Amino acid sequence: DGDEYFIGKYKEKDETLFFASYGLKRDPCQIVLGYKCSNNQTHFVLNFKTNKKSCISAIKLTSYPKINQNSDLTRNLYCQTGGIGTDNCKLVFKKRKRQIAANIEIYGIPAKKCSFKDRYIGADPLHVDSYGLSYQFDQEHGWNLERNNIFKDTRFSTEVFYHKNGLFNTQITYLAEEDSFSEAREITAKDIKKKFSIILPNEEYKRISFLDVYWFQETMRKKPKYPYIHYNGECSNENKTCELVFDTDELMTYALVKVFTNPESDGSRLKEED
Ligand SMILES: *[C@@H]1O[C@H](CO)[C@@H](O[C@@H]2O[C@H](CO)[C@@H](O[C@@H]3O[C@H](CO)[C@@H](O)[C@H](O)[C@@H]3O)[C@H](O)[C@H]2NC(C)=O)[C@H](O)[C@H]1NC(C)=O
Numbered sequence: 001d002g003d004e005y006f007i008g009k010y011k012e013k014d015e016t017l018f019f020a021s022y023g024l025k026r027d028p029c030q031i032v033l034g035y036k037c038s039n040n041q042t043h044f045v046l047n048f049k050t051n052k053k054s055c056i057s058a059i060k061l062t063s064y065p066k067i068n069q070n071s072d073l074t075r076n077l078y079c080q081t082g083g084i085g086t087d088n089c090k091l092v093f094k095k096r097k098r099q100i101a102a103n104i105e106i107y108g109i110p111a112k113k114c115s116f117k118d119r120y121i122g123a124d125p126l127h128v129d130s131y132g133l134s135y136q137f138d139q140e141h142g143w144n145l146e147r148n149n150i151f152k153d154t155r156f157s158t159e160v161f162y163h164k165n166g167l168f169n170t171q172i173t174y175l176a177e178e179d180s181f182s183e184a185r186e187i188t189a190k191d192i193k194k195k196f197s198i199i200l201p202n203e204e205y206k207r208i209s210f211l212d213v214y215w216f217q218e219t220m221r222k223k224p225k226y227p228y229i230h231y232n233g234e235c236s237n238e239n240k241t242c243e244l245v246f247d248t249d250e251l252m253t254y255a256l257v258k259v260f261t262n263p264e265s266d267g268s269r270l271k272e273e274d
C-alpha cells in the first residue's frame with residue numbers, strides 16, 4: 001500500500017522512540033516535536049536525536065503512494081550523520097516525483113546493553129548471512145557466490161561492497177562449505193574510531209578461513225566512501241592471532257565480523273580470474 005524503506009533490523013523488544021507523518025510537497029515541511037525537517041524537489045531530511053540513554057536500532061520510512069522502484073538496488077534512505085548504534089540520525093530520504101507523503105518510525109534499545117549481535121547473527125550463522133540470505137556456493141571451487149539482487153559497488157580489484165537495509169558488507173575473501181562458524185565479534189560506537197582494529201584467534205583448530213564483515217556508517221553523500229578493511233600483514237598459519245584493520249574515511253557506527261574457521265586453509269583462496 002505504501003513503499004517501505006529500512007535502516008537496521010527491528011526486533012520485538014525494541015522501544016519506540018519516535019513516529020511521525022510528513023507531507024513531502026509542503027513548503028516548509030511541518031516540524032513535529034522540535035525535530036528540524038526540510039522538503040525539496042529531491043530530498044526530505046529529518047534531524048533526529050533522542051535525549052534519552054538509548055541506541056537507535058531500526059529506522060523505517062513508508063512513502064505514499066506506492067511507486068515502481070526496486071529499493072534493494074539503491075540507497076534512498078540513510079543517515080548522513082549518526083545512524084544505527086547511536087542516539088542520533090540526520091535522516092535523508094531521496095524522494096521520487098510521485099512520492100508525496102512519508103511515515104517515519106524509529107526504534108531503540110537501552111544504551112547500557114547496546115548490542116545487536118543476536119539479531120544479525122541469528123540461529124543459523126553457518127548457512128545464513130547477516131542479511132537473512134543463505135550463502136550459496138559455486139560448482140568449481142565450492143566458494144561463496146557474489147550476491148546478485150542487491151546494491152553493490154566495486155572499487156579496486158577484489159573489493160566488492162554490498163548494502164541492504166542500511167547494512168554494508170564486504171567479504172575477505174571466499175567462504176568454503178566445509179568451513180565452520182567459530183564466533184562473531186561486534187564493535188560498538190564506544191570502541192569505533194577513524195582507524196581501529198580487532199585481534200582474532202588464529203591458532204590450530206581456529207585457523208581463520210573467512211571473514212564476513214558488516215557495518216553501518218555515516219555517508220556524507222548518496223555514494224559512500226567505503227572503508228579500507230584489511231589484515232595487518234598476512235594472516236598466515238604461523239600467526240598466533242590475526243589483526244583486522246578498519247581504516248575508514250567516514251565514521252562507522254556499528255560493526256560485526258563473522259569469523260569462519262578451517263584448519264585446512266592456508267590463508268589464500270584465489271581463482272584464475274585476471
Ligand atoms: C535539497 O535538500 C538537500 C538536503 O538539505 C540539499 O542537500 C544539501 O546540499 C548542500 C549543498 O550541496 C550540502 O552541503 C554540503 O555540506 C558538507 C558538510 O561538510 C560540505 O562538505 C559540502 O561541501 C557541502 O557544503 C548538504 O550536505 C546537502 N545535504 C544532504 C543531506 O545531502 C540540496 O542541496 C537541496 N536542493 C537544492 C538546494 O536545490
Ligand SMILES: *[C@@H]1O[C@H](CO)[C@@H](O)[C@H](O)[C@H]1NC(C)=O
Pocket residue numbers: 231232233234235236239241242243
Ligand atoms: C603475522 O605475524 C607477523 C610477525 O609478528 C606480523 O608482522 C603480522 O602483522 C602478523 N599478521 C597479522 C594478520 O596479524
Ligand SMILES: [Br-]
Pocket residue numbers: 045
Ligand atoms: Br542538509
Ligand SMILES: [Br-]
Pocket residue numbers: 011115116117118119120
Ligand atoms: Br540484538
Ligand SMILES: [Br-]
Pocket residue numbers: 184185186
Ligand atoms: Br563481541
